[PDB]
Design a protein around this ligand. Sequence first.
Ligand code: DUX
Ligand code: DUX
Ligand code: DUX
Lengths: 139, 139, 140
Amino acid sequence: MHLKIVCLSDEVREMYKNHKTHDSGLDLFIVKDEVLKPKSTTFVKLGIKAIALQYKSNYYYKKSNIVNTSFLLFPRSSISKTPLRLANSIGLIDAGYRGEIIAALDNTSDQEYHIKKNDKLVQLVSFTGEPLSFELVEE
Amino acid sequence: MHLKIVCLSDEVREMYKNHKTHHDSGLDLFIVKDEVLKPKSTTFVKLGIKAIALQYKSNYYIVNTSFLLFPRSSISKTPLRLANSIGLIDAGYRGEIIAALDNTSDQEYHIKKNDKLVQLVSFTGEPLSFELVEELDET
Amino acid sequence: MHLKIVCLSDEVREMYKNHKTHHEGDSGLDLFIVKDEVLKPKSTTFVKLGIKAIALQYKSNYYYKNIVNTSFLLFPRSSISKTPLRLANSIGLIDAGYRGEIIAALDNTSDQEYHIKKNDKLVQLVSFTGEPLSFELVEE
Ligand SMILES: O=c1ccn([C@H]2C[C@H](F)[C@@H](COC(c3ccccc3)(c3ccccc3)c3ccccc3)O2)c(=O)[nH]1
Ligand SMILES: O=c1ccn([C@H]2C[C@H](F)[C@@H](COC(c3ccccc3)(c3ccccc3)c3ccccc3)O2)c(=O)[nH]1
Ligand SMILES: O=c1ccn([C@H]2C[C@H](F)[C@@H](COC(c3ccccc3)(c3ccccc3)c3ccccc3)O2)c(=O)[nH]1
């Protein structure tokens, strides 16, 4: 899968240009420090919009070779140490979505939990589990 | 992928014939009757349908295929969670489809007929089709 | 998909030669708890499944911007839901280059202890295609 990603700020384009360690998942960044209040879910804004592209496949069903596809949003295994849990389990981002990617993070503790810019709680994966590439693009 | 689906009552068949939110890599299933979900419990909610999934044979390393039951993105606005994260429905299954919902709040939670908490999706993430049908080949 | 499991003990190698609940159709390969444990109420325990493993499939073309190894998935079993145990990271994603022990992060959501027994089955391995799975016991 290849992803085209729009950064919603220069700050965010700079952490994506310098993505160090990059797999069948693409780690997304927490982009702004933030406090997640206890026993409640926060819709964390990852400062990014993104289409996913994939080779057209033939499938059973009662215009191009390379198709706009749906993709998934997984919790990173990391999240386990944390009291944050994905409130929708796995994110499913339909092919036609053009909003910002959000991580719906459920804070299970009775305390505040603090996330920080450059934190890594979440990752994008393809329905194939195939390796992911991305380019930075302005629209 | 193509779903053949048996609706287990005329109310439910109504909902699916006039299904006004399926255009899609997922297929929204409806809550079929009002329920109060006890707090901090898990409840097995019956969805009023049997469903078989069909895909072109691949070579691994038309056939019956395994498929998935995802939470809908919008369940995140509630205290409800799929106990089993993502439902895995084997190819051989012909029973009623059921969602295991955890109510994670200290208070009861009400769900209503025509609520859409859950969706069917193919392992490929491809667009889905479905017909309604009076029964499955089971004999 | 095909799996090559190295069991990390002999007691565990036992479990897998005599695997009862896998047969030839399905899409999930059940994994055994491998030793008794108690999980402290309201907590997330890493539970070690006492195996390591690589998956292989017929390679295809993919967009970028024979037999290959591949990423695969650790799902909860349907049956986990009659428990207060939940998979913390929802679905484990295991990358083509993992060569360590399969571990299962389980939250206990109980305000009590929960004893997990050897030969319990809370968790299963699945392929991205949902296709049936073979396994093979291996030492390397
Ligand atoms: O894990 C996911 C899953 C879906 N989405 C996208 C795609 C979906 F159309 C849209 C759903 O938007 C949210 C929503 C909408 C209505 C009711 C509840 C929640 C959403 C975001 C994240 C997870 C689940 C749902 C949303 C979007 C923006 C702000 C708040 C909530 O956001 C994500 O970005 N992350
Ligand atoms: O998310 C899912 C996952 C699987 N299924 C199907 C296929 C599976 F065999 C069967 C699982 O049956 C339940 C079960 C099985 C074993 C141990 C405990 C519970 C089940 C259903 C739904 C979700 C999770 C578990 C079951 C069986 C009878 C009554 C209630 C629940 O139903 C669902 O409909 N939804
Ligand atoms: O469900 C899963 C998901 C991934 N993995 C693999 C791949 C990953 F690098 C490695 C990570 O193991 C844990 C980890 C990673 C980062 C930060 C903390 C902990 C892990 C395992 C299971 C669930 C969540 C996280 C890990 C590693 C060693 C000891 C304990 C836990 O295990 C599993 O075996 N089970």
